[PDB]
């Protein structure tokens, strides 16, 4: 790729962790040199703590700054809770309904059996439940899932596949429950 | 653990590249374009409901630059160890012939935050309609990145996401086809 000069990286992260709305908030400030976190400020601790010997100088120096410490201690409110409220409407409250399709897998390692794929895509937030039914009875064994795949554009997708030996007359159902809908979405495939 | 908002920034030498962004539960809210000194919202509508003063990012990045120099010295000039990316290509929805879709090239678990990505269609580079995100933070302190290519599915087209990174000895091509 060219230019093999050694590289030097410095990262700073201010993580605001929220539990039950803004009831419990934890602020975690961290410094990372290359791939090593050296020092951090954890609101539950209340002061800087070196994570490695390299960050010792900073934890001691910053902690000696009582004004900085107090600012950092009040941040759970002035920073975290404040920013949470700022975008609550298009983040915490964002809802996009999943598009659900079902199709038999074009790839079948061995005839007789089969694989039904339930594709659930374009949804937000991540919380979702996808279930497979056979003639209305829930299928629990034979089901595998990709889990949540974040698309990077505020949308998720997942694939939930049912291994089955379909018999004419059977009715297969993929059912999806997600915060964006009040009743489950269902798509059926008739063998 | 219900929600997490992160303000992540970085500065890299000798490239002299810095980045400033906010993310919510892993998705980018916005970042600051350093050359235009402006806030860039991941989804256009976010900007219609909130604002951020970009100059503040500029001031933090200057401090990050200065701090990188300090740590570079303190570590006796220990450089970063390259970690090559994992690359996967998928569509954002099931593909149906002659129905518009989008190829997603997911570049994950790499560092430093410098990469070259190119979409190929039948071996030739394509640029029309493509987009990408900035470098997104990971809990292990590596990075993730997404590149996108809107396309019209066809039975003959073969696509590649070509990725180059210092941790790789050669270009890594991840293929996709209907």
């Amino acid at each position: 790729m060219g230019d093999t000069r050694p590289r030097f990286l410095w990262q700073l992260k201010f993580e605001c962790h929220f539990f039950n709305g803004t009831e419990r908030v934890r602020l975690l400030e961290r410094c990372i040199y290359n791939q090593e976190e050296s020092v951090r400020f954890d609101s539950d601790v209340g002061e800087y703590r070196a994570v490695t010997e390299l960050g010792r100088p900073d934890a001691e120096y910053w902690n000696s700054q009582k004004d900085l410490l107090e600012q950092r201690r009040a941040a759970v409110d002035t920073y975290c809770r404040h920013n949470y409220g700022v975008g609550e409407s298009f983040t915490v409250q964002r809802r996009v309904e999943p598009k659900v399709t079902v199709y038999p897998s074009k790839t079948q390692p061995l005839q007789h059996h089969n694989l039904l794929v339930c594709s659930v895509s374009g949804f937000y937030p991540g919380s979702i439940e996808v279930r497979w039914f056979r003639n209305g009875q829930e299928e629990k064994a034979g089901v595998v899932s990709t889990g949540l795949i974040q698309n990077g554009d505020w949308t998720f997708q997942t694939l939930v596949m049912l291994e089955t030996v379909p018999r004419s007359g059977e009715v297969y159902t993929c059912q999806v429950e997600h915060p964006s809908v009040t009743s489950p979405l269902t798509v059926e495939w008739r063998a | 653990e219900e929600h997490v908002i992160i303000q992540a920034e970085f500065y890299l030498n000798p490239d002299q590249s810095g980045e400033f962004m906010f993310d919510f539960d892993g998705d980018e809210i916005f970042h600051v374009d350093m050359a235009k000194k402006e806030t860039v919202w991941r989804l256009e509508e976010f900007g219609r409901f909130a604002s951020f003063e970009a100059q503040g990012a500029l001031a933090n990045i200057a401090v990050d630059k200065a701090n990188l120099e300090i740590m570079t010295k303190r570590s006796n000039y220990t450089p970063i160890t390259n970690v090559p990316p994992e690359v996967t290509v998928l569509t954002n929805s099931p593909v149906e012939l002659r129905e518009p879709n989008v190829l997603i090239c997911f570049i994950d678990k790499f560092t430093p935050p410098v990469v070259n990505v190119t979409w190929l269609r039948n071996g030739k580079p394509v640029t029309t309609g493509v987009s990408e995100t900035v470098f997104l933070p990971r809990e292990d302190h590596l990075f993730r990145k997404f590149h996108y290519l809107p396309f019209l599915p066809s039975t003959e087209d073969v696509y590649d996401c070509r990725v180059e990174h210092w941790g790789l000895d050669e270009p890594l091509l991840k293929q996709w086809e209907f």
Partner: peptide, 13 residues
């Protein structure tokens, strides 16, 4: 509604 950022702190020197 405006996002507020935490300021970067200069390291010990």
């Amino acid at each position: 509604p405006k996002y507020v950022k935490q300021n970067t702190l200069k390291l010990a020197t």
